[PDB]
Symmetry: D3
């Protein structure tokens, strides 16, 4: 429906009949580099997806490469001051925080380069599916750049603080089974990562809206707390989710 798919210049959207929305980064000529305009579009989409009824998102990059990172051309031309760039980083965080804590399951279908800000974007999804062409790296460090978008936060949760520091400090590249085993992606396929992502998304979309909402917002929040306080919060999350009428019906079913 146009109410979900229109309004974006750098994203191509395709809403399926079961509520799965394919969100395709659409600047293939620039390897889907993320400029401020695209980030704002991500903020808008992920701020409203839940309320608009989107049941799950399959996030992919148009072309052979998922995302080449922050748009360094725009950055270089903009000749940003430290405060201008700090502000740009907060917009990246607003988009990625809405993805991580927004409650709509996001499954990234990766191909080719998932680098720098592109790895930050991939990390903001709940699930990642990589194929035989996919590789991960934070190569900007070699050119004096500190990766943003919360990669230092999310990639540390994915592969461990020390492997994350190794990646940004050395520009080390991971791919194939090695990358999956490291924790960069939960799924690796010999075929189409898009098709595998759709299979996962369709199954997820068939689950209860509230249950998926809790799974895709409460767990990240609880990981930010002491486990002794998270326990208490979890009891309230379980109280609401597990006593919903639709849930009771499924148990009976």
């Amino acid at each position: 429906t146009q109410d979900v798919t229109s309004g974006y210049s750098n994203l191509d959207l395709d809403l399926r009949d079961n509520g799965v929305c394919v969100v395709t980064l659409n600047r293939p000529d620039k390897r889907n580099a993320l400029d401020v305009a695209t980030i704002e579009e991500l903020v808008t989409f992920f701020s409203t997806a839940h309320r608009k009824g989107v049941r799950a998102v399959v996030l992919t990059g148009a072309g052979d490469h998922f995302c080449a990172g922050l748009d360094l051309v725009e950055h270089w031309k903009a000749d940003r001051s430290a405060d201008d760039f700090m502000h740009v980083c907060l917009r990246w965080h607003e988009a990625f925080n809405k993805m991580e804590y927004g409650g709509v399951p996001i499954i990234a279908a990766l191909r080719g380069a998932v680098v720098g800000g592109g790895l930050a974007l991939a990390s903001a999804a709940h699930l990642r599916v990589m194929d035989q062409s996919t590789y991960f790296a934070l190569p900007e460090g070699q050119r004096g750049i500190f990766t943003g978008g919360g990669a230092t936060i999310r990639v540390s949760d994915m592969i461990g603080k020390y492997r994350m520091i190794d990646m940004i400090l050395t520009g080390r590249v991971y791919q194939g089974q090695e990358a999956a085993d490291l924790g960069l992606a939960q799924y690796i396929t010999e075929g189409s990562s898009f098709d595998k992502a759709m299979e996962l998304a369709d199954k997820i979309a068939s689950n209860l809206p509230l249950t998926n909402f809790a799974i895709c917002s409460a767990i990240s929040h609880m990981q930010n707390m002491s486990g002794l306080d998270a326990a208490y919060a979890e009891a309230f999350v379980g109280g609401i989710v597990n006593t919903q009428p639709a849930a009771r019906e499924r148990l009976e079913a």
Copy 2:
């Protein structure tokens, strides 16, 4: 001694001469599903084990399956309100928090199904030993249920926040070497997981009570703090543990 082993209807206890207590979930006809009464028995046992002198616990399920999770039959019949269930979840947390932070080493000897609330229980032990029949999953999500018992907290520490979200979101199953390598169990055996657990427990029971106490309570607490404040707490833990007379004797020995 009856002072340690009597008083439980759903648990079968066997106290060995070296202080190792075998705690066996004993509802094999229901695949050791955890109902409120069993949870209360776990709260009682783990609230008092340290003060009663138990040196280590080998936790296992009677039968071919460790634990089938929360008792969904009791749940369905009870037709719980959100607040009734929130309260039931707090009891699960009281039992599992007493296990994790209580200071008595717990070694789970797993077999067959370790699912849903059963994985939450297994996660509350310090060590897990799995065998060739053991498998892990959080299958309730497919039926609209959010897993409780702190699995979102402990399993995230075990396998990573994103693999934990993947498990609850998709119902994904892990077993064999793959599960051990993922972080679901530190030990995998080709033989008896109970026998391997006993070997581990006997060695642990031969160590100093206070040292084991600190290992099995302080580390979980320190992980809940900033590493800069945990450092300070660790200095005091080390100060008390490492200057005990029994410790000095062992160095000399």
Copy 3:
């Protein structure tokens, strides 16, 4: 230069022309066991390395073994009170916290035994390179000792809280590819770990001082915060690092 290399009795220093400083634990006759005097030397070196211009550190042990841990001979002879030892532990933390958050990249070239306090020291480096002779363990637990130096904090980040508890509780030893895959070291070599560490250090030293500084201090700090507050801090770190003139020059370059 003497301004960087002189002043240490238990450490041997070698400053290379590109700012890489080799810091060699130098008590090979005692397997580089760490006594209070050596710890104080580590506090001094790592408190001043950044301001003295050191660009990266290659940390190694003289001889066939990296570090045998806390000096148990000094400990036993000192017959320390709980408060005396608590104070000794705070000095270990001061040294290791200066290593972890000080902003100077530290690459440990490991060989042989990396045990007890020696594993705590290795863990305080950002990167670890192990060879075919390297092994890791926390064997003091068997003799009633709780490992200090923040190993419970850092090793948990490296291999997971539960694998860390397993190591201290059982004295379990890891080595070879198994240890690297577990997360004990990011690099494993069939040749010289010192040579591989130097290769890494030389590449790191060729990067921008400020970028390396942020990578080697900000990430550890952000991991101590809720991801929602770390996001904000990261924006300011990115703002300062990514708008430095030297960075702009490298983009143009």
Copy 4:
């Protein structure tokens, strides 16, 4: 300007030439109770105020009472499920978190009742100015319910965890100088709270945008961290704010004696 004050209904907006925007809850016949429509307007306004160039906000309620809290009528009628209401609460948090961490100085000009969700709203502003008619309460318990809008977090920061528990647990009312001294408001006036709020806002709007942004976002974030980690973050905030070109003229003013 039309791009800042247009499109709203429950809120009345007035952008002054110096960048101060007066945001008035405009449902006086309902004592400005916050229903879902009004919360969504607050989410919209505070999500974009900074980027739209608003320099400061004076938040007030039309009529004799600032805000009576959650619209209990809409709530009772909707007969909400626990998940329906949890979702409503998250919208409140989206609005109030944007107010607290958004970087735009907000000064609440209070009058009369500042109760329940109304106190949650007042607490989400950086500064509060109360007058002699202002009174504070968390009467939720009386209705048999729990507060929301982050009142348990913000009011505890304002008056202390134990005084916040006392307020919701007993329904205790605070007003006058006692309320100001307790920490419910930094300013209390014998006259118009609105005029005092405008005075504060005009002075704030005359300061540097970046500096106000940091003050109105960084401090709340640093309070959520261990002080040892917050110190490191503070250094980066100061590094960016304290070396901005716009501050050098003022630093020079001190160098001599013009300042």
Copy 5:
């Protein structure tokens, strides 16, 4: 009832018909010093009070002094090792954490000395009522020792980290209105603190059990989190408490004008 008040020795218990239970430390000849036996009784009582249906607790000390703290005699005599005493402290925490996070409203009716561990005990209650004879101190330093029972945590929440450090570092004594204003007690009376505590408790007991449970457990937990994460948890607490069937009658009372 016998299933609530039986089996104790160091504590005297009186369960009133409205569910208010009066818990009295009963060792007046020792100024109610807390020895290990008394702490275990507090652990037992507060671990089960909620499930036993206690609606509110009025905690008080027999005699002229609320509680003189750790039983120094038992302590000195036991000549405890550092690990022995660390274990004793953990039992204190088990009792006091159950009081703070247990969900049962606790109102302390203070008189005379509320010192050392005695202040730790008073701090573990949600509300404190002091009279004109009440005084507060953390004289541990004088004995050459550190406080316990979570006083460094709770008293800092009550009066501020720096005032808490001042108290233990100098042995400074607070009393009267000054103590109340400092944050040591929310209520101060010219008469009987016990009667004022009972008034508070009876009103609290007339509110909804679930609502009081949330107020007396959720707020302390949310203070331990970043405010951004606490907000999410608050939404779930409100979702459950605010949609409970028992609250609808009261919401209706407001819908009209009976309320």
Copy 6:
């Protein structure tokens, strides 16, 4: 002694026979503005004071004003890059964190201006004694800049997050009894703040070294944790401090009646 008071320039040090060391900022003609050289001396002194045996510190400023904050002249002239200044701020934190968590009791004897970084410095001490000439402010905004030295952390702990935001956001000045009551200083005197500080310090120095160390380091660390985790840490702190041999004589003093 020469091994404690030698080698400094910007600081004047006087070690008294009872172990109390008077640390005086000695740049009165500059109102004791903290430049990089002075911060490095504070880092050096507080990094070693505990191991050197200093029992307590009385921190004061030469002249009529405690400390005017960051040396704005050096700052303006250096025309620092954001990273240069971030690094300067980290040095400030190294000094102030060593003061707060170092374990050596610090008592600030204030006079006149305690502003900007000067308040950050005063806030890093455990106790503050103000006189009738003392006034507090965070006038950074006026200079178009942000505070530093952890003022956003420590002052928020002292007077409340919202009063701290008010101070930097409006430049509001506090003084007299009002400042003391707000939480800016635990002690206010009609006479000499220095003499009152010395009285406090001498009494503190007469207590046990280990006990003071814990009080002056453990409490700040425990405030950075969830209260449930802090309780466990407190038990270990108490285990070590409360069983120290040196405290038994004092415990015995109570056993009888000599105490």
